[PDB]
């Protein structure tokens, strides 16, 4: 039979990201002298819409400490930051929405976005519109910090790892119904070519494990093992449970 749809995506032909209009990668400043000893000041020169993104970017310019020139950065904008505002980044820096501080330097309950996984990676976690992470504790010996990510997971990372105070802007985007095919259409038009989706059960056997039969139906359990091999994994992969989730979610 045929190579199924989820196998063809990895070869990246018609499936690569539609990148032309994007403002450029959002990152924190490089972690340098200023940021790990002192603080350094910047101005948000603009806050701007990035294509295929939920949340606005903020263009933030700084002075180059080692050379006379301006150096401009692209930040994900936290809700409430504004044009003309001064941004402070460094180990010793006041605790205010929009500033970037090492996770060690903020008290528990602090709310931060675009937080680094390792120190220096210029931010990894909690970048999507509406999201943040909460600092749930410190271990000053071995200087770690325990945080809770948007997924509900709780991870422990270096207290040197930087984050930015506040939550990411443009929240509530997903509360509004798309209402029609076209709105979805233009949505994925600026992301990648994932839409619309043919059901495997509407296909012929060559095309898909679910394909075929004189009635539409899966024909065997749609829960597939991790051990499964490419061309086998479609449906519910490695599911530990299945069915309507009753009762409260929200991990203890």
């Amino acid at each position: 039979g045929r190579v199924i749809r989820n196998q063809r995506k990895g070869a990246g032909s018609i499936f690569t990201s539609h990148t032309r209009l994007r403002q450029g990668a959002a990152k924190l400043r490089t972690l340098d002298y200023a940021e790990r000893h002192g603080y350094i000041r910047g101005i948000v020169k603009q806050i701007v819409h990035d294509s295929g993104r939920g949340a606005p970017l903020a263009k933030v310019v700084f002075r180059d400490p080692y050379k006379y020139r301006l150096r401009e950065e692209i930040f994900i904008a936290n809700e409430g930051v504004h044009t003309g505002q001064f941004i402070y980044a460094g180990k010793k820096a006041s605790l205010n929405v929009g500033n970037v501080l090492p996770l060690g330097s903020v008290p528990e309950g602090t709310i931060v976005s675009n937080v680094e996984e390792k120190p220096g990676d210029r931010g990894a976690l909690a970048r999507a519109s509406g999201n943040y992470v909460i600092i749930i504790g410190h271990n000053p010996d071995e200087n770690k910090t325990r945080v809770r990510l948007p997924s509900g997971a709780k991870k422990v990372i270096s207290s040197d790892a930087r984050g930015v105070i506040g939550v990411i802007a443009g929240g509530g985007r997903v509360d509004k119904p798309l209402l029609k095919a076209g709105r979805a259409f233009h949505k994925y038009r600026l992301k990648r070519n994932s839409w619309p989706k043919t059901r495997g059960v509407a296909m012929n056997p060559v095309d898909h494990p679910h394909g075929g039969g004189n009635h539409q139906h899966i024909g065997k359990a749609s829960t597939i093992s991790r051990g499964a091999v490419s061309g086998q994994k479609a449906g519910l992969i490695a599911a530990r449970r299945t069915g309507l989730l009753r009762g409260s979610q929200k991990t203890q």
């Binding site: 105070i165 506040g166 443009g170 119904p177």
Partner: protein
């Protein structure tokens, strides 16, 4: 004279998509097309384009807001909670 009984702005969709969907949408649309009071200059000139982006007609200041509304409940409480924890540092 009152033009429509319920649908309001949402009457552009006519009979389509089902009432509950139109209900939800009408809400956030009223939200997102509104003029908001400007923190900085005091007039209500703040309108939207590009969800998350709220700028002032005169005074030209742009603020990062919620997707369909200027300030969102979460960011609001977050604001005060940062205020709280900050004042714990100086005093």
């Amino acid at each position: 004279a009152k033009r429509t009984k319920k649908v309001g702005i949402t009457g552009k969709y006519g009979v389509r998509y089902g009432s509950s969907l139109r209900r939800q949408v009408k809400k956030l649309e009223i939200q997102q097309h509104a003029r908001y009071d400007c923190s900085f200059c005091g007039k209500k000139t703040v309108k939207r384009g590009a969800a998350g982006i709220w700028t002032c007609s005169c005074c030209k200041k742009t603020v990062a807001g919620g997707a369909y509304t200027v300030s969102t409940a979460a960011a609001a409480t977050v604001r005060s909670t940062i205020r709280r924890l900050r004042e714990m540092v100086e005093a």
